[PDB]
Amino acid sequence: QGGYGFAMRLKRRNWYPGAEESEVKLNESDWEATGLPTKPKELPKRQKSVIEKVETDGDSDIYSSPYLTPSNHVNQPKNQATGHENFQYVYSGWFYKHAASEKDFSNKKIKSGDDGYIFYHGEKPSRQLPASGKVIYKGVWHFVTDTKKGQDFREIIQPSKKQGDRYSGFSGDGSEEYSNKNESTLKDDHEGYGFTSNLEVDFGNKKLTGKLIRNNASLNNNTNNDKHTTQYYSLDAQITGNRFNGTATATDKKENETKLHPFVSDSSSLSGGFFGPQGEELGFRFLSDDQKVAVVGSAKTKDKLSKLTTVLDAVELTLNDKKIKNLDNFSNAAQLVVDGIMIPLLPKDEFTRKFEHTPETKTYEVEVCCSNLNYLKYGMLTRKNQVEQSMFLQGERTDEKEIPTDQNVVYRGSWYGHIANGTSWSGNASDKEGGNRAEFTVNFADKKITGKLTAENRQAQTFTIEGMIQGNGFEGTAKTAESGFDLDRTPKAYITDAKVKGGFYGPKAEELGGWFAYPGDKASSATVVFGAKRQQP
Amino acid sequence: DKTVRWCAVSEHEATKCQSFRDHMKSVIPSDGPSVACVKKASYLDCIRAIAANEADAVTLDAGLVYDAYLAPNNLKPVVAEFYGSKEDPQTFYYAVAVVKKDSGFQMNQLRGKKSCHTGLGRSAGWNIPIGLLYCDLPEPRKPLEKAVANFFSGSCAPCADGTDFPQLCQLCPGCGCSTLNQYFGYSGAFKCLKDGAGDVAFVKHSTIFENLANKADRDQYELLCLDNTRKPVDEYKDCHLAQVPSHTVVARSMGGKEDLIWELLNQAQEHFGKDKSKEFQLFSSPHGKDLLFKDSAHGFLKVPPRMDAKMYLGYEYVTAIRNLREGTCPETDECKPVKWCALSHHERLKCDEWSVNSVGKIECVSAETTEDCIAKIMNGEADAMSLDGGFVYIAGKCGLVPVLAENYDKSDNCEDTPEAGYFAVAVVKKSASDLTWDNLKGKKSCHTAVGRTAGWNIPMGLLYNKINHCRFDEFFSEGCAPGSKKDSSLCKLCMGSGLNLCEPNNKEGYYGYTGAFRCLVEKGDVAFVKHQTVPQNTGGKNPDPWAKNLNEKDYELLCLDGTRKPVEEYANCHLARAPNHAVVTRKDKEACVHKILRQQQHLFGSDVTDCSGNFCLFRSETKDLLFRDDTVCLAKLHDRNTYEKYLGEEYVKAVGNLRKCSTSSLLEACTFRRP
């Protein structure tokens, strides 16, 4: 339910005389995934490609937010929050062109007016966050409204094009006259230029609040107004992992007053995530509950010139070259993100599960354990269209605060592994009987973890793990005992001192998982991912 | 190294060009423009060479100018050869159709008549008249000579193939191609009309003036006009088949070096032009006739930047030649869709709604500026639009005519009731006092847009008479005058965003009457607008946040006599009277436009009560889209169908008094074709 980004397309109402659509509202169905940007400052490919193909009468240009990389079109419009202007990971904004009317008279349809999208997208969703503290994020926001016959928002967009009636009102409209976007200087209480966002993220309490405002213009008549900013919303959200969820509250309501602007309803759909190495940037959307308004935004910590905590683990281990890659993940252990697409790890509609996912180039073949693990998933991932081999593990780490102190805690589980010297043994996660078996004892007080992985004929077929715990995760080594695995008188395989890394997952460390590849050093080789659940005493 | 590469079509030309090069070198300083001669096989080759940036200029006849303009050559007219005199230069000649007095037939009555042509493949003689008649010819229209032979009852078509198409030689048997044929050439054709051989002669305007022995006796003849009336022979500027440029030098449209070329040619005519030098004659050579320029050239004129090949050749010429090249005829017979020209997207959106509601009797074309739109109407690209009187003035000089007028006065007699026009007023804040018409200097100004009646022409012309000099951006400290040069001080107060700033369309919020008033409110000292603007925008009449709370009693009008009066007093305080805005078109579309608009306004006009559920042609939000928002109706002009007759002698003098200050490109181009 997380993602790299989302966009919402402007609506064009059908005015065909006598066939006229009274209104077109917005839905949650209308969000489109942007997919991972190659360059965040550029427009999202899929949607740009849509607007490119849109017909125009003589203005063929795609107009966009001023800080976006244009294609194509001192002075000139600014949208930024002062002191947080410089975005690396995340961008929000809009792009449109002035489209020709679309006429099908066989169906009695004409849609007129601009065509485009509001969107946000980011790269490198954060796997780490500040472990506490309150932090200011400032940024920008943008909106797109529904269309209703007779509707206008006079306080935001001057309705010479019938904005809000024939096509969506949106923050990009050329007719939107009351922001300070075009001025050369800021008043002291201005937060910046145009529509700017302000958030306070409390990483200690896992909570965020904020306000979305417009910065108003000041010249001559109207300088009587004393208020250089106007606040349309406040925000509240619960942070979990790198994602947050919450509500938006419409700030300006005198009601019973009918309104000269779109922001009226509150929202229960506020959603977003942190991007960058520390989660120093974020982007978000919400859709008002009356479906009259949709918003996207981005915000970032103060531009340049607390200890961190690890929120998740996501790893791919390539079977051939014996390499470990980090996978992006949205702090959903059930969403596998590879090659910029999201594989559902759970069914739509048993212990270990195999399926094929063909996105809409490649086809992915996925075996995933386990049915009893909610915060962690691990298994085999294979790529085809001829075939590439991998195993994966991902889990949502337990809060560093929620970690158990119990001195004896037993975890039981399974593993996938592939191991060779001269010949290959491979075996898969099973919930009995002579199948792959994983055993762990954890002394949390002592910060020590030991375990053994036993294979089919056991053991015999075995692995020994000792590690130290820090915070929400552990490191250690794995050894084959002596001498060799048996790789099945028989050939064996020799691994001493494989580096093991892992974490604790879900509330109160209900689950644990980990992995190692080998060699990483200067013989034999192995790759293993394992995961286990916390037993009762 | 600034070098004009001239294109030669023959070795004789090449050697003349080299003589040209060498003689220029003796006159132009080393550092300046020089000639390079490049030789090609033919004019086509030259045109391609220029487009390929292998060369720079060449001089073409009219037909080739059109060819040069087409993709992928995209070449444009830059310099013009002129003839016959310096004080009254002939850049153009007029192809006319001359007939006898009271012979009672018009241009659309030609089928069946007897025709006299100067000769086949000649411009005025053949290509123009046959091209304009092309659709009237019976099918098959290929081959052309056969079709023509079936259209006229008989002809003299010198050079025509008489063997295959006898009736083409009927009036000059054999169709002789030399002056041995008494009917060949210009005089030949005219003598064919005079002899009573044919009913009509296709010649140029100078032909009868030259070939009449008695020279009175011109009253025995008339000219056929494209609107299917006849005018006297002297009226040819107003009655003609096409206006064609004689010899035109062309260059690339982009990166064409038009400056260098004009510097070179201008210096060349100074030293080597008519009678200027014994050493070298630009306009003759020993080697042959008409090398690089016509031997009859008296000099060169610069073609204005705004011009492009279509605009320079003119509507009628392009129509005739396109008919001939393309050959597409419409399959019918009553009024075709009127193509309305909209200003940017704001007007385009409303125009689309209009078209859907008129069920196709109206169609839509956009341009980003009024001048752009007017030019499209000249083209054929567009048919009509409504214009501020300052622009009905420009459109007039561009050959467009007024058809219906916007009436702002409320009555039940509206369409039939001519109006004297509205008032141009100078509007200031009551709070700011002691600022008077007497000195506005150094103050900050707001105009509807440059070249418009109230916002520009009236007030600036008056100011011009006071100050006797053209730079008004120096006179005012700052202002907003949309359509001004973007780096001007008159662009500084403009609210337009980024490159929209000071643009003369609705992308700039200070554009137009309301735009200007909002400028006075929010920035300026004085706004130039129509007398109705302040009452339209105060007392809550305007709902938008900026004008929502505005009160009428807070403003005053500047009187010419140096006093001030409340805005209601506008009758006794005003700068001048402004002619109502009017719809304009091409003469050929004028009947259709008059009839279609009368029907359209009976449907969507101010008789429409509820403007939400239904389309109101005369309303928009403060923006005057396609028409002034106060238009009550569109009214009959009657005899007032020319811009001069429509605007009145007084306004046309005032705008003319401002000619020296004009930044208009389109006006420059138009007055060049027709002073």
Ligand SMILES: [Fe+3]
């Ligand atoms: Fe006007």
